[PDB]
Amino acid sequence: GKLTNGALEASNVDLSKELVNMIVAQRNYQSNAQTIKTQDQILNTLVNLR
Amino acid sequence: GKLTNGALEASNVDLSKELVNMIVAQRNYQSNAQTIKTQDQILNTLVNLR
Fold first, then answer.
1. Residue A20 and residue B46: Cβ atoms within 8 Å?
2. Chain A residues with CB inside 8 Å of B50's CB?
């Protein structure tokens, strides 16, 4: 491509696009963390069974 | 061209052509500036959504 004497390039980031992905990723992290509790409790019941 | 003597060139600027360009340029400026307000008031929603 061609150059342009006196210009810069912007930084490619849409802020309104990035501020909604964090809302999805935080709930993703929380729903993943909510599986360790289920696993831990089904282990603890098998330990305190006998 | 011809070298006419005893006479000078004028400015070629038509005043009634320039006094109505200001009206449409000021309306264009105001319509461009009202886009910053609606871009800001939709980012003010997403920064308070959480």
1. yes
2. 23
A36-43 long-range contacts (CB < 8 A, ≥24 apart) are: none
How many angstroms separate the Cα of A12 from the Cα of each of A6, A15, A22, A25, A48? 19, 10, 18, 21, 56
Tokens of A22: 């964090």
Q: How far is CA B50 from CA A20, A23, A35, B44, B45, in A?
A: 10, 8, 24, 11, 9
Cα–Cα distance, B5 to B3 (Å, whole number): 6
Resolution in angstroms comes to 2.9
DSSP string, chain A: ----SS--------HHHHHHHHHHHHHHHHHHHHHHHHHHHHHHHHHHH-
Contacts of A23 (CB under 8 A, 6+ apart): B49, B50
Q: Verify whether the Cβ–Cβ distance B47 to A23 is below 8 Å.
A: no
